[PDB]
Amino acid sequence: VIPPAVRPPRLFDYLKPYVLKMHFTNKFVHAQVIHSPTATVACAASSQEKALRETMGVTRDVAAASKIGKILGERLLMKDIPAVAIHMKKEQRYHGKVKAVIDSVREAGVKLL
Amino acid sequence: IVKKHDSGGLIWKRIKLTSTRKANAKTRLRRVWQNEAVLKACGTSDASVS
Amino acid sequence: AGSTKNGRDSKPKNLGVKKFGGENVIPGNIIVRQRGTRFHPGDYVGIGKDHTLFALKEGRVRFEKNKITGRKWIHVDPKGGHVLHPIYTRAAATKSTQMETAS
Amino acid sequence: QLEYLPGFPRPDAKHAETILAVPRSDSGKNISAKERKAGRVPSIIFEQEDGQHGGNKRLVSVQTNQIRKLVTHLGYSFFLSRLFDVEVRSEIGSDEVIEKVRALPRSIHLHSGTDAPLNVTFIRAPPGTLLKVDIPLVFIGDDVSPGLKKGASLNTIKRTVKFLCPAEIVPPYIEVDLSLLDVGQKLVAGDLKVHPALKLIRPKDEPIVKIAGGRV
Amino acid sequence: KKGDVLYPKRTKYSKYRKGRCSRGCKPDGTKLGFGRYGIKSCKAGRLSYRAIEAARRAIIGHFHRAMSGQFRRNGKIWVRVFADLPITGKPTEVRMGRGKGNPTGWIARVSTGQILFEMDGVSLANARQAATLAAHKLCLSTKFVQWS
RNA sequence: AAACCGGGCACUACGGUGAGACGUGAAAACACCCGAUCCCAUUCCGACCUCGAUAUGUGGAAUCGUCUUGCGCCAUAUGUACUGAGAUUGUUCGGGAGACAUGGUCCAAGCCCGGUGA
RNA sequence: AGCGUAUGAUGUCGAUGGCCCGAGGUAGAGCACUCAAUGGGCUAGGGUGCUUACCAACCCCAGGGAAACUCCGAAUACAGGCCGUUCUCGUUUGUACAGACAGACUUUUGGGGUGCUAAGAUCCAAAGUCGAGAGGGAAACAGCCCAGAUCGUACGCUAAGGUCCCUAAGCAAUCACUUAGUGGAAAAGGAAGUGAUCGAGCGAUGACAACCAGGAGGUGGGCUUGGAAGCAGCCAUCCUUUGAAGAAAGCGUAAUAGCUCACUGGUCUAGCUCCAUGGCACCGAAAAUGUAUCAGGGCUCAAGUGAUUCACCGAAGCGACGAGA
RNA sequence: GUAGGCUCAAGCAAAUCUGCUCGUGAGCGUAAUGGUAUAAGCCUGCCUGACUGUGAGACCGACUGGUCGAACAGAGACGAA
Ligand SMILES: [K+]
Ligand SMILES: [K+]
Ligand SMILES: [Mg+2]
Ligand SMILES: [Mg+2]
Ligand SMILES: [Mg+2]
Ligand SMILES: [Mg+2]
Ligand SMILES: [Mg+2]
Ligand SMILES: [Mg+2]
Ligand SMILES: [Mg+2]
Ligand SMILES: [Mg+2]
Ligand SMILES: [Mg+2]
Ligand SMILES: [Mg+2]
Ligand SMILES: [Mg+2]
Ligand SMILES: [Mg+2]
Ligand SMILES: [Mg+2]
Ligand SMILES: [Mg+2]
Ligand SMILES: [Mg+2]
Ligand SMILES: [Mg+2]
Ligand SMILES: [Mg+2]
Ligand SMILES: [Mg+2]
Ligand SMILES: [Mg+2]
Ligand SMILES: [Mg+2]
Ligand SMILES: [Mg+2]
Ligand SMILES: [Mg+2]
Ligand SMILES: [Mg+2]
Ligand SMILES: [Mg+2]
Ligand SMILES: [Mg+2]
Ligand SMILES: [Mg+2]
Ligand SMILES: [Mg+2]
Ligand SMILES: [Mg+2]
Ligand SMILES: [Mg+2]
Ligand SMILES: [Mg+2]
Ligand SMILES: [Mg+2]
Ligand SMILES: [Mg+2]
Ligand SMILES: [Mg+2]
Ligand SMILES: [Mg+2]
């Protein structure tokens, strides 16, 4: 079948302008928080960064995803962003690296919307 | 106008298109053509001081 | 003797659009009464169990059409604009006021 | 090398008339009916280049008698596959030449019941312009063919073939020789003898004509 | 098909609207699709399938008689008009309303300019004579068409 | 630093979706090549997905570019169909398709991370 | 419920138009789905005697019908916001009093269904008139055209419709057409009168019509066949000499014979024949008390038809003067 | 009801799987129409919100009456959320 175009969820009562999106490659893990009204990155954490690619041994596994999630949660609380909304792609489930990033963000003290 | 002339028992006679009827139609056409010319000339802009 | 076996029809249902594009709505106003999703719900539009579309916020009806598939959505553009989630107004907006009054 | 090759048909000198046109101030059914009541066919002269924004279009009217005579004498398909000189004057018999152009008649609308001309369309074709033209086919050699001497019948599948043509060497027709055709086998569009600068638009495996088996 | 008389083998519905037939043309003009000669209509109207088959039989018989030997069978006809609309009727001594009547025949709706027959494999004179012979079976005004 | 390159998000049918041909793996990136111990995948199966593992192999599959095109899509005729008002039993004034036909597949363009330039 | 009245109380309306803006799936069109359906190209295959004028699925090309099909798709209409015009409350609502719930006809059968594309039929949509509306026109006339009667006048201007008489006002003006009383009932089809325009073909190289002379040879083509010889039928339909002549277009013969035509030369001399678009005429055209299908006279020496033009007549419409509420 | 997972029908190649075309033509108990693809279809686990009392605001409309519904209180089901 022809795949339908993916739409953001429809607004019901409130805006919720901060959206968390995750990306994983063969070498690095990524996590971007997007400000939807301006299409700008409010906060981002990845193991490809110059300050982070040497402070951890493995930059591609589940442990790296957990570390990047904790770093992103601390950075989000530093920018006074109390809560984010989770966006999963077509192939992403609540398992493995996605689960590690989500659990580390929630454990850092950021509410999930 | 009634256009039923060859059916039924109620006679609606066919009004012949005479030259006098054509003259009246031409007069009505001249009136509507002058009205249309006035509307074309005046339709380019609106009057001010509203 | 002749007899027709066709004499039935059903009562009218009065389906269709009640609020066209640009019309003002208040919460609870029915926008479309339909069978199935002839129009899909958009932002600030609810959908009922008989696929009735109703406004969730005060605002104006706006129609959207997908150019590729032909699917149509109906949105309400809210009168006072978007309202942030209360967790952002309690914390992020107070820090926003602090950042504004420090500037 | 932009000349008709030897041994190929050229446009005839007898039908090389100049089409006379006068300008037309508007478009629509109203002015078209008023022009046809005055004995003129509404028309348009345009070009390929800016198809959006009109084609540098000029609205004209041509005489009904000249168009009817040309379509009757040439034929419908032969009229649409032959270049013409179009002269635009300020009025009929004047001297203020507004445009003198060599144009192809792109389309002509004849009335479905009375076959009176309702619209003629001319596209500007200066040298070096490539036009999609439907060239009619002339079938010769049917009195010499072995297939039709035996009593079989001719299935003429196509009467026109579409070609992309430079404007200089648009053939008025393509002669199809049937003389080496006995019963059963067929000619395709690749078998047509054309100038090398003409390109088939449809695939070469399109059957043109076929001698089908006569009933024993 | 069904040999001579042409109507559908089946229809989705048995009883149709009357419809309107006095209007309708071909807005782009008409050209022959299969043959070199043809018959087109000049008016808009209704033709019964029996009249269409009578005209076809007249063309076929004229080609069968005027040509002999090997060119007798070389004349080919195309029938471009098809009676696919059923008509109904009611018997005598029957009052006006107890439902629609039983189907009684088939008609074809014809527009102005619509091509009715096409001919190939014959001479121009025989095509003209077959067109004249076929026109007398039809209740609509027709015209002889030549490919050009 | 200001441009360029890679990836992620965003924009979007002139920007979509196919086909063919030619290239490209920058000291970097993406993917594949390899495995199935734990998580996960299989109503059988590392086929898919997942978790692992790659001083440098490959761009065969995908992913990037360039052209050629097919459908679409956008723009635009001319004429006709149809139609609103009006009865010279529609001699007028307006609207105007579908199918044709002609061109185009633009221009502009945001944020973050990494690399080269530095 | 909708629609009438009276009397209160509220809105700033109601009505109508402009601009902006919104969803459409009808008319039309088209085949991309469904149904209905035409011709061809390829070949599976079936079946015949390697072969198979026999049919041949699936694809491909051409083609293109539908109220209960839609790749498309109007004009109108409708909803909403704002702003003009009307200065009228005709709007909403309280209270009190109703009547009415049998409708008719006309708008191309060009909004449709049913009926027979019948009905002064019947049933819905959208207008109008009658109902409940007089006046002028349509001979006479509920429903068509024009137009809304408070009253008076022996004043004026107009609408529809008229201007030879009947009958108020033109034997009106200019340019064309018809000679059928067409106008002033009736189709397919026939005939080709009379104009307008554009073609086509032939033509002093002599065309058309007319008169004169030839119209041949292989050949009696082969078959068929009692005979078929140009001419019952089948197949061939070539060639030659020619100025020209068909293996013959008519007739005619049992078959031959014979007489013409196509074709050609001579004489004569100026244009001749058919194609297209549309103009106006002719035939097709028979009912019953009495002409009886311009109302009648009569009209072509238009008072008929097409186009252009000027005056006038014409209503209870509108004005003037006088009078009411 | 919910959470998770999955994607039909038809055609073609190999000749039931595996793939490629294609697009709503499958399914959704039951007529027809409209709708529908990370579903409204199919499979699995647990459940019983197939609750109690209400309801801003609308859609139908002679009236009787019918329909959709954000949201509130209580008691729950499923879900990492
Ligand atoms: K379940
Ligand atoms: K609750
Ligand atoms: Mg009577
Ligand atoms: Mg009467
Ligand atoms: Mg006169
Ligand atoms: Mg007058
Ligand atoms: Mg226009
Ligand atoms: Mg168009
Ligand atoms: Mg239609
Ligand atoms: Mg059609
Ligand atoms: Mg339809
Ligand atoms: Mg409005
Ligand atoms: Mg009653
Ligand atoms: Mg009643
Ligand atoms: Mg009634
Ligand atoms: Mg009507
Ligand atoms: Mg009716
Ligand atoms: Mg009737
Ligand atoms: Mg009646
Ligand atoms: Mg009655
Ligand atoms: Mg009414
Ligand atoms: Mg009464
Ligand atoms: Mg009244
Ligand atoms: Mg009256
Ligand atoms: Mg009277
Ligand atoms: Mg009267
Ligand atoms: Mg009054
Ligand atoms: Mg008098
Ligand atoms: Mg008469
Ligand atoms: Mg007559
Ligand atoms: Mg008598
Ligand atoms: Mg006067
Ligand atoms: Mg008076
Ligand atoms: Mg008065
Ligand atoms: Mg007074
Ligand atoms: Mg799910």
From Swiss-Prot, chain E:
A GO MF label: structural constituent of ribosome
Lineage of producing organism: Eukaryota, Viridiplantae, Streptophyta, Embryophyta, Tracheophyta
Keywords of this entry: Mitochondrion, Ribonucleoprotein, Ribosomal protein
Origin superkingdom: Eukaryota
The protein's name: Large ribosomal subunit protein uL16m
Localization terms from the record: Mitochondrion
Gene: RPL16
Family: Belongs to the universal ribosomal protein uL16 family.
Span covered, complete protein: 32 to 179 of 179
GO terms, biological process: mitochondrial translation
A GO cellular component entry from the record: mitochondrial large ribosomal subunit
Quaternary structure, from the entry: Component of the mitochondrial ribosome large subunit.
Keyword presence, Repeat: no
